[PDB]
Amino acid sequence: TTALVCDNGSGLVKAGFAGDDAPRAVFPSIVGRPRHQGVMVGMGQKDSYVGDEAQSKRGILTLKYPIEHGIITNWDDMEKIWHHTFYNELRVAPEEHPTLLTEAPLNPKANREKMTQIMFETFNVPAMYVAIQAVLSLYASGRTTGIVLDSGDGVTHNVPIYEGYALPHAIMRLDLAGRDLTDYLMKILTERGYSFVTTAEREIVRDIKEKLCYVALDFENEMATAASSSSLEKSYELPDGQVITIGNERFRCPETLFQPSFIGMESAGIHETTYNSIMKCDIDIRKDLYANNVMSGGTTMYPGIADRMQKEITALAPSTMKIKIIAPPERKYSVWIGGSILASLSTFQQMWITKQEYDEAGPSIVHRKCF
Amino acid sequence: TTALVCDNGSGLVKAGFAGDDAPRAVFPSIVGRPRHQGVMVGMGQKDSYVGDEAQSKRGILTLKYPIEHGIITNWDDMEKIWHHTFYNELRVAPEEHPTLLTEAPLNPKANREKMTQIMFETFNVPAMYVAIQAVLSLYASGRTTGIVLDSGDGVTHNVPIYEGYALPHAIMRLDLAGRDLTDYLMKILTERGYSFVTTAEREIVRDIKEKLCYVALDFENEMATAASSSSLEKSYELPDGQVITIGNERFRCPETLFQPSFIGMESAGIHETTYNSIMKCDIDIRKDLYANNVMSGGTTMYPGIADRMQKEITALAPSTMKIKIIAPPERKYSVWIGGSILASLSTFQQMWITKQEYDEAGPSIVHRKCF
């Protein structure tokens, strides 16, 4: 009997066994359906495609995401994805093993409650549990104090923790995301004559973003350098066979994390949110928090992002103290890494939720036990 | 010194003087060239024909449009058309008067930049200016709030404006056009035995569309009414002298504005685009936008189009609020009407672009001044 660790973020879906260092199933969460007409008879057809197979044939289908902001919008598409993982991609019986699921900090109550019935009633599975995706980043570092920062693709947020005591009046959540950065890029490229408007066209705009984008350390002189010299102007080809030339939009797209006025959302930014989170804390434990800034988002992989946060906070902190941003190189799977430790842990074995507990109270047991 | 107002849409070209209520030159923008062989000697010949003269002799020439989607494709054909307006059709010197030109919202940068050199270097004309064809619809109404909708023949789009403050993160542009409605009609008529395949044959298919087409208020019962009773079946004659009988294709052609799947373009429709434009706005100024829907396209002239938009949005709006679509009867020239007001306006006289400003910076001055 080994437990199962399942992460389901917005976008990629990750899963594996307990007691390991790497997952086994990584694939996007898309549900596609055809839209043209069938003619030839002898072929075998399907009404929908789920895993990586829907990615291979995108010239016909209409793609669709179930999760938008960390909130389950369409439940019938979600049951196809969990059925795809337990049988086809990974091979296991459901009733043999316990599971472990992760969520977001301030989502509403019915999101973590409808998923109790599915893991008990339609899947006869014992011993589930629900965690929070900020505590699980500290187990990958092995520390016991500090402040985290995870963005990924749904939401960005940060939770301060000192000596194993969390501070609930200091959690900050911002709805600026990863897919909003994709959508702003395909608006800027119409200033040279490129136009990508289809759900299928969206994924070859994502693939440009991951290859050649960087966060500049300064902003004003970069607008004057690239306007005079043609030095940073690069090129890229697409599956039609043509050539696309991109310059001056490489660094201009990740600058919305520091000035959210370009979208029109009125907020503060990714650096003043971290500064106001420490300021709402006490006066005696601020010193141990300037030296511990872990940072483990999927969006964090841009080059030049660590040196930018060094320069910004020292303009806000007083002149005596010391700052330090920690960035491990494998900071993409770190939410799955901490899930492997807590499942194989010995003290944890009284924190499961048995099937008899559900028959006594019902689906409202989850607000009492886990937190 | 009176200024000149020149509108150049896809198709018709309109022009006149400032301070007036109606233009003076209305003619299509076509360039034709012959294709057979000349035999008789004593006649006087020309290599090409430009204005309405090319329309009179279409049995020989090959017609050609310069503008396709709101984008200048062929520059050498464009210089013949502007030369035809300033001298032949309207009689004026170029260097005496200032001009005023209009464009589309999200066209690329080089479209509004190559036309700066032509209005300065090859035409010695001072004080040009470039506007946007959505702001100019509100001056014809005299209001100061509301949301517009202009289609015409190139592109359909909509811009929300509140109290003289535009909202740049809410502009929606759709490439479904007027000439695409012509091209779908000449595909459907081959189901009875009619075939029109030539660039010269295209204009007598356009003339059918303007005379007998209507937008039905319902769609499903109309397919059952006209299939049983022969009531709405009418007739039409052509310059050969024969008789054409058309029924069931009268309303079926403008239904692609509500279901764009008939072409194969995958989009939303003309009514969900307007609904999602208000929803991306704030929460406090939605009430002043449900009561102000101006609508001033050239394509809007179908009968029964105003009552159809009343019925559709009330299925999407909440049950308390009030909707109102405004449709003035002279909504065809309204983009030229607003151009006459802003030219004769007193405060406007510091917004021109002098010739000395071009000699200081160059053709990149247009991205700074006008917007």
Binding site: G193, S195, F196, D240, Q242, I244 | E68, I71
Partner: peptide
Amino acid sequence: XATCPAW
């Protein structure tokens, strides 16, 4: 200039 065919 890419997938249109007037751009």
